[PDB]
Amino acid sequence: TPLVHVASVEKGRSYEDFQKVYNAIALKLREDDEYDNAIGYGPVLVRLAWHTSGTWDKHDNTGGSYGGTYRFKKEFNDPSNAGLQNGFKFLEPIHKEFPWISSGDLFSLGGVTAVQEMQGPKIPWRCGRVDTPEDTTPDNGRLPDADKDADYVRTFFQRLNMNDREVVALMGAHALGKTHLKRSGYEGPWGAANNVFTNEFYLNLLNENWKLEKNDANNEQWDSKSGYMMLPTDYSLIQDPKYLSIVKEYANDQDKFFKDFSKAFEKLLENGITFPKDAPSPFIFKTLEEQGL
Ligand code: HEM
Incomplete structure (x- = not known):
């Protein structure tokens, strides 16, 4: 027990x-x-x-x-x-x-x-x-692994007692910082600000033009012409219809994202x-x- x-x-x-x-x-x-x-x-x-x-x-x-x-x-x-x-x-x-x-x-x-x-x-x-x-x-x-899909993400977070809304809210922390090739085998920032906490992650997922590419570590990641990236697990949030609805909600309501993130x-x-x-x-x-x- x-x-x-x-x-x-x-x-x-x-x-x-x-x-x-x-x-x-x-x-x-x-x-x-x-x-x-x-x-x-x-x-x-x-x-x-x-x-x-x-x-x-x-x-x-x-x-x-x-x-x-x-x-x-x-x-x-x-x-x-x-x-x-x-x-x-x-x-x-x-x-x-x-x-x-x-x-x-x-x-x-x-x-x-x-x-x-x-x-x-x-x-x-x-x-x-x-x-x-x-x-x-x-x-x-x-x-968690980064090379996986929405089903993996959902199942993974059940071990942490997080539901769909809590998962999508938590992932919004990817507004911050960047991936570093030598650390994780992924390279690049999710957005422009990097050290200001906003709902930019969701706006970028929805509004950027993403291309599935291989980085210099031979791993797939989604890249935009703006110089941003998304991990396969990030991108899964717009592939899964349940996650997608929540991504849209947070992209359109800064206060709601803040409140939900804080709780989660x-x-x-x-x-x-x-x-x-x-x-x-x-x-x-x-x-x-x-x-x-
Ligand atoms: C499916 C779930 C997640 C996966 C697969 C994942 C994966 C990753 C990877 C691969 C990196 C890059 C590490 C590096 O190369 O430096 C990273 C960075 C980061 N992660 Fe996530 N992550 C997940 C969820 C979260 C959550 C829930 C939070 C916090 C609420 C979070 C916060 C961050 C932050 C702030 C960075 C930037 C670190 C830096 O700039 O040094 N992540 N994550």
Whole structure:
């Protein structure tokens, strides 16, 4: 039967403590602006939060964000995690300054901070993930393949307890960053902005003229004359009629996408965690801009 992971608040800590950690992440995001040809660390931090959470298996409550297990070599050397060492290195000085925060809390908070600082929706966030030992590290192979179709995507996300709307909303994070050939065997950005969180992914899927091509790694990807790309799994969202309707909805309603993304992303980051009835309410952090910082 499933493991139980009970959220336990870092001793004596409250909203103000976590806002300080948020602020340190946000300030470093602003400072270290030349990483990845001036994209900055925002996208890789979102990907780190997702891959550290996305190992979860609803059937037995293995993997997931709780244990912060990416810090162990089996997980940080997962071929699916290639490049995420950059997000981990970014977070190192943060963890040094705030050694009291758990690894799971830091990885998930990095993702929340990145989305909000890149002008995305507010993502409520709860503390209390607790570091678990090396033998709790999930095996490689729990993160999704990119060369597959809509049926694969739908089935895959059932393991994370996500439905069609939640899947399409989550994939909207591909507005951010790019594929890097040496990391994943795919090359190129999904859009123009790269470090601003918008509904551009959906607009690009629908509005661009896509050609199925082979990249320099001999893998198929969909390319547009604008210099954008889509993975086979991204493109599957417009091949499947159920996914397509949701893509159209998000392409035509920025607010609805923001709201749905926020819920799904929080859910992703919280999967596998039992919050005590008297745990604090989720925190909604202010951006640097909102603070006048
Ligand atoms: C079918 C599901 C998914 C597949 C197959 C997939 C696959 C990929 C691949 C192959 C890359 C490129 C890695 C590289 O070469 O650097 C990537 C990047 C990225 N992924 Fe996804 N992904 C999926 C879902 C998601 C989700 C649910 C999120 C978050 C909500 C997400 C966030 C990101 C971000 C922000 C990047 C950019 C990373 C960077 O620029 O360094 N992805 N993904």
